[PDB]
């Protein structure tokens, strides 16, 4: 009825790196490779090489809408792909190398990826599944060199190409979740979604990302695009430190101090191992100020450990389906007067719903449950970076949403008058161990319950195909969980 | 189109207030009214009353796309209108009461405003222009009571109504710029533009707005929606302190200390009056940490004075056409090792282009000028909250754009290798005095009816007219527009500007 005079300028992920190259071109991107060697590059060079990757991928037959898959850890070549693939209007499919060969083959075949980029230390896995892949036309090793039948990344680079412009709602990337019963389910992100997510999650009450920050994502670049951190860090022009596959405490500490890391993010298991190490050696990190924990619930103790060592811990919550961040923990101004015990309890809560997210905790018919911090309901979400369904799966799509169009997370929670959310349970019958999913059912038909664990956070226990980490440690369900609550003895 | 699975949810300004009510509902909104009295409300109450305002305006015949105008200063009722009008799918036209009666009547008629909300102290102005208005059906006084022929705001409130959602690219508000030749030109903002602006401008390297902040916008709610600060403050759930028309230093200090203000934003003239006050009294602000100066260039000495008191000063730049923020000043990490003097100089620069803004300093063909901090060119912009033209004016629209689609600001600048912009000059021939525009041409062409009017640096105001009185007042000019001094086919102005550079003693 009344048009605005505003320009119809589309949101695009390439604009982050373009701005980084122009304003913060000398800012460093530091990578530790699988061999332990440390590689140094900058935003200016990443931008140049990302343009070369766009031209190289075009020469390999990649066009707008085509899927280019990755199987790799956090390093500069993965960051170059993060921009080049969406930059040419293609779809960045981050695949998880920790999954079974059968699961990876299914996901790559379902997405119909045209090109696969993968780390050299993952060649045995690629050689193992290669014969099962039906769409992959080119296999690119993310390294200087590649063996027979394989193409090296440095060889695959072509002439510099200009980025391709698309409507912001077009696909930029995709990822499959294994936190579900049956087959993996695909979620397709858009430029619009990930740009908005990068902005809204990086505010002061969120990750508070600044140009002066040095950012180390411990979360894998195959876990919801490392929680969108590589994009958000580029947007502000922060120095990035990409740790690679080595996530042992001594390796991380070396990077924390050596590179002057100020901000980091990862799953609870990595931080528990890090805290164990810092406490045993009496070593205190010389620059680290902020740490976010996500993927699973952070134990109250984990927060108390780091706060004692001078590290601020902020819980984050989300799903593959939500890009991922929908909830972030910070202490409200008027709640700073709470006692140290009360404040620790508050920090141990999941947190507050972030900007541009409509969150509710509701029952079976979509009715919100009372805000008393006691009543249980399902977390339900609506927003521009929240999925409205799945790719190529009609039954998963129609069971994903409520009648009034809210996405159903499958997580049971409470919420209070202050607006704080607390994940308490899960509708979905699954085990999450060290930030990776195990299906109870698949182990059964071959009763399996999730039992709390100190180090990881849940471990399979059976009652009387698969990888060694999936194996149940020891040999109506709301009873066996409460009965064997302390089998693995974890607080 | 390999389809994304992401929800097709629109960006809407109402979402800021709905979130504020749900999560930060007890956070305060404090206003000083025109009488000096202090009013106290909360986000929850503002939310509830804004729903009543939507219901009330609907009963008055306001529909989707209709324009609702305001003529008022910073207070809770203006904030309620900031959300209710866009929340019902209508268009909030923030009008400037400092303009001439002829200018205000023109913009209200041009925008075809249906309802006018105004401050009680601006009643004489509204009464003076009422006969000139052709579209305004309802006149609402933003107060508890109203005289005959006028509706009181509290009376105008109706039943609580649910918000209406419009396409994000549709209009949420509009404002007219007087920083142009001829009649004022209208800029129409979208929900999408202002939501994105609020997000991108509020990052750590920007205003760094937080729930813990106490925000005091000295910038008027008719100056590009108070630089979008009432929206961004609501977004983060910060406490808001709205000073009203009383912007004198004593009145502000009471609010700075009494309410625990952490963040503030305004024009250099207001901050110069504050610095003079604090220095002359020896009074020190107890809570103020951050101060942004915009609208005009912040003098190097102004920044030093506040930094000497522990207040961080960050320059911001924009236009009515740009929502307004496109450039913000902050010191890059690797330049923190610069000396005190060098850092103060860097802070005096306009700053760095902010996220989602494509900025260039370009020549006449649209080619970027060298990044040596010497070569002059025009600041040209592209982005989702930058205007692509003007409302109901084709000529002005086509003259505001380059062939490749960049908006022409009319600002002459230099830029360096670090990306820092410095505004040096203006193509447009106007005077900006205390944040308000004076047309040199309108002053010249009037005078010659019986001349060359140029902008000269001023200590207090930022520029004052010098002509190279009664006749000018009769042609429709106010006291503040009159040139301070007179000294006895276009005009070669650069020479007169350089010759009389220090005429109004002090650059
Ligand atoms: N902060 C948290 N507290 C409690 N549970 C969490 C938290 N964050 C995530 N979860 C759980 O983890 C689930 C999301 O897992 P998932 O979709 O696999 O994302 P991810 O762990 O970040 N890795 P990815 O699968 O690549 O997206 C949620 O549904 C929650 O059950
Ligand atoms: N930080 C700054 N430094 C130098 N000049 C500035 C700065 N900010 C604004 N300007 C000038 O002011 C012009 C914008 O004026 P204008 O469109 O009136 O915005 P505004 O004064 O902030 N809001 P409003 O008074 O409602 O129009 C720009 O074109 C610049 O010439
Ligand atoms: Mg999931
Ligand atoms: Mg203007």
DSSP labels, A349-402: S-BEEPTT-EEEEE-TTSPBPPSSS---EEEEEESTTSBSS-BT-HHHHHTTB-
Rounded Cα distance between B423 and A360, Å, is 47
Rounded Cα distance between B141 and B156, Å, is 9
Cβ-based burial of A114 (10 A; exposed 0-12, middle 13-18, buried ≥19): buried
Helix (H, G, I), strand (E, B) or coil at A259: coil
Quick one: B37 and B20 in the same domain? yes
Q: Residues with beta carbon inside 6 Å of ligand 1?
A: A 175, 177, 179, 223-224, 294-297, 315, 317, 319-320, 324, 350, 409, 411, 423, 426, 435
Rounded Cα distance between B341 and A381, Å, is 51
Rounded Cα distance between B163 and B86, Å, is 9
Contact A216, A360 (CB under 8 A): no
Contact across the interface for B193 and A1, Cβ inside 8 Å: no
Residues of B in contact with A192 (CB under 8 A): 4, 6
- Tally of CB atoms within 10 A around B61: 11
Quick one: B418 and B492 in the same domain? no
State the nearest Cα–Cα gap between B116 and chain A, in angstroms: 18
Ligand with the closest atom to the CA of B320: 2
A101-to-A78, A124, A135, B129, B315 alpha-carbon distances in Å: 21, 11, 16, 78, 55
Ligand with the closest atom to the CA of B185: 4
Quick one: B117 and B177 in the same domain? yes
* Contacts (Cβ under 8 Å, ≥6 apart) of A282: none
SS (H, E, C) B428-454: CCEEEECCEEEEHHHHHHHHCCCCCEE
Q: Tell me the CA–centroid distance for residue A226 and ligand 1, in Å.
A: 12
The finding on whether B184 has its CB within 6 A of some atom of ligand 2 is no
Quick one: B207 and B321 in the same domain? yes
Q: Kindly give the number of the ligand 1 atom that is closest to the alpha carbon of A409.
A: 29
> How many domains does chain B divide into?
2
Q: Kindly give the number of the ligand 1 atom that is closest to the alpha carbon of A176.
A: 25
Quick one: B493 and B356 in the same domain? no
Residues of B in contact with A175 (CB under 8 A): none
* Contacts (Cβ under 8 Å, ≥6 apart) of A488: A451, A452, A453, A454, A459, A461, A473, A474
Residues of A in contact with B24 (CB under 8 A): 332
Cβ-based burial of A451 (10 A; exposed 0-12, middle 13-18, buried ≥19): buried
Quick one: B333 and B411 in the same domain? yes
Quick one: B393 and B471 in the same domain? no
Which protein residue's CA is at the shortest distance from atom 16 of ligand 2? Answer: B319
Read off the CATH number of the domain in which A180 is found: 3.40.50.12780
Cβ-based burial of B417 (10 A; exposed 0-12, middle 13-18, buried ≥19): exposed
Contact across the interface for A188 and B382, Cβ inside 8 Å: no
Rounded Cα distance between A172 and A16, Å, is 14
For this PDB entry, the determination method is X-ray
Contact B55, B62 (CB under 8 A): no
User: Which residues span the domain enclosing B457?
Assistant: 429-507
- Tally of CB atoms within 10 A around A399: 11
Contact across the interface for A193 and B382, Cβ inside 8 Å: no
Dihedral, CA of residue A396, residue A402, residue A408 and residue A410, to nearest 10: -90
Contact across the interface for B4 and A208, Cβ inside 8 Å: no
Please, what sign has the CA dihedral across residues B209, B213, B218, B222? positive
* Contacts (Cβ under 8 Å, ≥6 apart) of A310: A284, A289
Which of B107, B176, B295, B330 has most ligand 2 atoms within 8 Å of its beta carbon, as the pocket-test mutant? B295
Order of strands, sheet of B171-177, starting from the edge strand that comes earlier in the sequence: B151-152, B138-141, B115-118, B67-71, B91-94, B171-177, B185-190
Active-site choice (A10, A103, A155, A177): A177
Contact across the interface for B4 and A333, Cβ inside 8 Å: no
Resolution, Å (one decimal): 2.3
State the nearest Cα–Cα gap between B2 and chain A, in angstroms: 5
Helix (H, G, I), strand (E, B) or coil at B459: coil
- The distance between the two most distant Cα atoms of chain B, rounded to a whole number of Å, is 72
Q: Tell me the CA–centroid distance for residue B435 and ligand 4, in Å.
A: 11
Backbone phi, psi, residue A146, to 5°: -145, 150
Quick one: B131 and B60 in the same domain? yes
Helix (H, G, I), strand (E, B) or coil at A325: strand
Nearest CA in chain A to B186: A5
Which protein residue's CA is at the shortest distance from atom 24 of ligand 2? Answer: B223
Active-site choice (A27, A114, A349, A432): A432
Contact across the interface for A6 and B387, Cβ inside 8 Å: yes
Quick one: B331 and B413 in the same domain? yes
State the nearest Cα–Cα gap between B440 and chain A, in angstroms: 28
Backbone phi, psi, residue A341, to 5°: -65, -45
Of B6, B187, B195, the CB nearest to A385: B6
Rounded Cα distance between B176 and A97, Å, is 57
From the DSSP assignment, how many helices (H) and strands (E) are in chain B?
A: 17, 25
* Contacts (Cβ under 8 Å, ≥6 apart) of A366: A380, A402, A403, A404, A406
Contact across the interface for B6 and A355, Cβ inside 8 Å: no
Exposed e or buried b for every residue in B325-345, given b needs 16+ CB within 10 A?
A: bbbbbbbbbeeeeeeeeebbe
CA angle B307, B310, B311 (to 5 degrees): 65
Quick one: B262 and B201 in the same domain? yes
Nearest CA to A312 among A330, A297, A326? Answer: A330
Residues of B in contact with A388 (CB under 8 A): 5-8
Order of strands, sheet of B464-467, starting from the edge strand that comes earlier in the sequence: B453-456, B464-467, B485-486
A218 marked ligand binding residue: no
Interface test with A, best of B3, B7, B24, B262 (most A CBs within 10 A): B7
Clarify whether A432 is annotated catalytic: yes
Read off the CATH number of the domain in which B507 is found: 3.30.300.30
Residues of B designated as active site: 177, 321, 432, 437
Q: How far is CA B38 from the centre of its chain?
A: 24
Rounded Cα distance between B292 and A134, Å, is 58
Of B2, B24, B336, the CB nearest to A65: B2
State the nearest Cα–Cα gap between B3 and chain A, in angstroms: 6
> Cis omega before residue A33 (within 30°)?
no
Rounded Cα distance between A400 and A394, Å, is 10
Quick one: B238 and B214 in the same domain? yes
């Amino acid at each position: 009825a009344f048009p605005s005079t505003m320009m119809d300028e589309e949101l695009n992920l390439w604009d982050f790196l373009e701005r980084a190259a122009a304003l913060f071109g000398r800012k460093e991107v530091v990578s530790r490779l699988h061999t332990g060697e440390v590689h140094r590059t900058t935003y200016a060079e990443v931008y140049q090489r990302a343009r070369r990757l766009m031209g190289g991928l075009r020469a390999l037959g990649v066009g707008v809408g085509d899927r280019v898959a990755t199987l790799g850890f956090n390093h500069f070549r993965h960051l170059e792909a993060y921009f080049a693939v969406p930059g040419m209007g293609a779809v960045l499919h981050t695949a998880n190398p920790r999954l079974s060969p059968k699961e990876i083959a299914y996901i790559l075949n379902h997405a119909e990826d045209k090109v696969l980029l993968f780390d050299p230390n993952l060649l045995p896995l690629v050689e193992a599944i290669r014969g099962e892949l039906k769409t992959v036309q080119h296999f690119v090793v993310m390294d200087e060199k590649a063996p027979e039948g394989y193409l090296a990344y440095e060889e695959a680079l072509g002439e510099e190409a200009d980025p391709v412009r698309v409507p912001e709602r077009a696909a930029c990337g995709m990822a499959y979740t294994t936190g579900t019963t049956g087959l993996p389910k695909g979620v397709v992100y858009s430029h619009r979604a990930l740009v908005l997510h990068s902005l809204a999650a990086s505010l002061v009450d969120g990750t508070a990302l600044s140009e002066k920050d040095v950012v180390l994502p411990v979360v894998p670049m195959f876990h919801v695009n490392a929680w969108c951190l590589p994009y958000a860090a580029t947007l502000v022009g922060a120095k990035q430190v990409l740790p690679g596959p080595r996530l042992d405490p001594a390796s991380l500490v070396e990077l924390f101090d050596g590179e002057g890391v100020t901000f980091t993010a990862g799953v609870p298991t990595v931080w528990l191992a890090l805290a164990d190490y810092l406490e045993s050696t009496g070593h205190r990190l010389k620059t680290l100020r902020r740490l976010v924990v996500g993927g699973s619930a952070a134990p109250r103790s984990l927060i108390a450990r780091f706060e004692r060592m001078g590290v601020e811990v902020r819980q984050g919550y989300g799903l593959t389906e939500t890009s991922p961040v929908v909830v972030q923990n910070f202490v409200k101004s008027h709640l700073e007067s709470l006692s140290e015990e009360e404040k620790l309890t508050l920090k141990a809560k999941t947190g507050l719903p972030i900007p541009l997210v409509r969150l509710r905790v509701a029952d079976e018919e979509g009715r919100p449950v009372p805000k008393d911090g006691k009543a249980l309901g399902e977390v339900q979400l609506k927003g521009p970076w929240i999925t409205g369904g799945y790719y190529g799966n009609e039954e998963a799509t129609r069971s994903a949403l409520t009648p009034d169009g809210f996405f159903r997370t499958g997580d049971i929670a409470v919420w209070d008058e202050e607006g704080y959310v607390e994940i308490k349970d899960r509708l979905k019958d699954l085990i999450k161990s060290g930030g990776e999913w195990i299906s109870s059912v698949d182990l059964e038909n071959a009763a399996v319950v999730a039992i709390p664990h100190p180090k990881w956070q849940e471990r399979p226990l059976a009652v009387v195909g698969f990888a060694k980490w999936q194996l149940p440690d020891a040999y109506l369900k709301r009873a066996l969980r409460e009965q064997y609550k302390n089998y693995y003895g974890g607080a």
